[PDB]
Amino acid sequence: HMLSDEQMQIINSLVEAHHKTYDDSYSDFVRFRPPVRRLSMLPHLADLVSYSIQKVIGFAKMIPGFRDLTAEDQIALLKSSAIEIIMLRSNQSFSLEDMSWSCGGPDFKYCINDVTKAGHTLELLEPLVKFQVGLKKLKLHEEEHVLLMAICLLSPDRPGVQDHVRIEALQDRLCDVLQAYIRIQHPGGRLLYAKMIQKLADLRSLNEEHSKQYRSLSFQPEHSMQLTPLVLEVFGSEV
Amino acid sequence: NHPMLMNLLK
Ligand SMILES: C=C1/C(=C\C=C2/CCC[C@]3(C)[C@@H]([C@H](C)CC(=O)O)CC[C@@H]23)C[C@@H](O)C[C@@H]1O
């Protein structure tokens, strides 16, 4: 029927957080190693991924209650979900006209052939694009896109997490917010929330295929030396 | 441990 004060505040800082960690002009991309079209795009794309990981953390540090989880749970959540939040947040640069991420002119317009030259096979990129297409096609609001990312970050079923009772509770409070938001403030879409939860299941499958290609890549020194320290730490198997 | 992840988390 209505949104509560606590729930309006959960929405406000989530939207603000995303605004503090997402630049719709992509003006920092000039500071990355330049794109080159055997894996000539890996330097740039590792730098892009490493940048975004930093972004995903600053966002995560502002999700209500994340800060209060023990350090090991904050780490466990960010380690398993980071790539999924990157796929989710990447949707803002994806374009249906060109079927690509358009972060700039010809340099920063990333297509499937490009991400191939960063070491990823069709078996991951073919679902990723279809996920991007269907996610764009839901025409989410700022408030829903940002709830979706926080709901993804707070999944209790990640390897490593220890206090899955409390993480469960934080994620259900956000699912309450999203469901209330969609009903009160989203004219259409009675089935939209069920569709958004489906998108989470898709990202789990994306997460698994990525992990395999990344494990294979990270284990090859000629390629792992083109990665960044942060990428190797967040996507790597340490504890 | 995770020195870089730790540092980014204030
Ligand atoms: C990640 C982002 C952007 C693009 C994301 C892109 C376009 C390039 C290829 C990526 C990284 C995919 C690769 C295969 C995953 C990986 O490197 O292991 C995942 C999302 C894809 C640009 C802008 O939207 C900022 C956002 O923060």
DSSP A125-161: HHHHHHHHHHHHTTT--HHHHHHHHHHHHT-S-STT-
Q: Which of A151, A183, A28, A137 shows the shortest CA–CA distance to A84? A: A151
DSSP A27: G
Helix (H, G, I), strand (E, B) or coil at A94: strand
Query: Which residue's CA lies nearest to atom 25 of ligand 1?
Result: A90
Considering only the beta carbons, identify the residue of B2, B3, B8 that sits closest to A54.
B8
Spatial distance between the Cα atoms of A94 and A20, rounded to a whole number of angstroms? 20
CA distance readout (Å), A32 to A50, A54, A98, A107 = 10, 14, 23, 12
Radius of gyration of chain A (CA): 18
Inter-CA distances, A72 with A66, A68, A156, A170, B7, Å: 11, 11, 13, 16, 13
CA A110, distance to chain mean position in Å, is 17
What is the rounded distance in angstroms from the CA atom of residue A73 to the CA atom of residue A169? 14
Q: What is the rounded distance in angstroms from the CA atom of residue A206 to the CA atom of residue A159?
A: 16
Question: Would you give the DSSP letter of residue A66?
Answer: G
Determine the Cα–Cα distance for residues A133 and A152; give it in Å rounded to an integer: 19
CB B10 within 8 A of CB A59: no
State how far the Cα of A189 lies from the Cα of A34, in Å rounded to an integer.
42
d(Cα A115, Cα A137) in Å, to the nearest integer? 22
Amino acid at B6: M
d(CA A6, ligand 1 centre) in Å: 33
The set of protein residues with a Cβ atom below 6 angstroms from ligand 1 is A 45, 48-49, 52, 83, 86-87, 89-90, 92-93, 101, 103, 110, 115, 120, 210, 214
Sheet containing A109-110: give its strands across. A94-95, A100-102, A109-110
- Kindly provide the resolution of this structure in angstroms, with one decimal: 2.4
Question: What is the dihedral sign for C-alpha A163, A212, A31, A111?
Answer: negative
> 3-state SS of chain A: helix, strand, coil percent to 5?
65, 5, 35
Which tokens in the block code for residue A38?
């055997």
A91 CA distance to ligand 1 middle (Å): 9
Q: Is B7 on the interface with A (CB under 8 A)?
A: no
Q: Measured between CB atoms, which of B1, B2, B9 is closest to A61?
A: B9
Provide the residue type at A122 as one letter.
Answer: L
**Both structure tokens of A20:** 């503090």
In three-state secondary structure terms, A186 is coil
Closest listed residue to residue A44, CA positions, set A127, A132, A107: A107
Phi-psi region of A4 (alpha: psi -120 to 50; beta: other; left: phi over 0): beta
CA distance B1 to A34: 31
Contact assignment for A233 to B9 by CB distance below 8 Å:
no
CA separation for the pair A209, A155 (Å, rounded): 19
Distance of CA A126 to the CA centre of its chain: 17
CA geometry: angle A209, B1, A223, nearest 5 deg: 45
Specify the experimental method: X-ray
What is the best residue among A50, A93, A217 to mutate for testing ligand 1's pocket, by most ligand atoms within 8 Å of CB? A93
Scanning every residue of chain A, which has its alpha carbon at the shortest distance from the alpha carbon of B3? A233
Residue positions of A in the annotated binding site for calcitriol? Answer: 22, 52, 89, 93, 120, 210
What does A190-213 look like in DSSP terms, one character per residue? SSHHHHHHHHHHHHHHHHHHHHHH
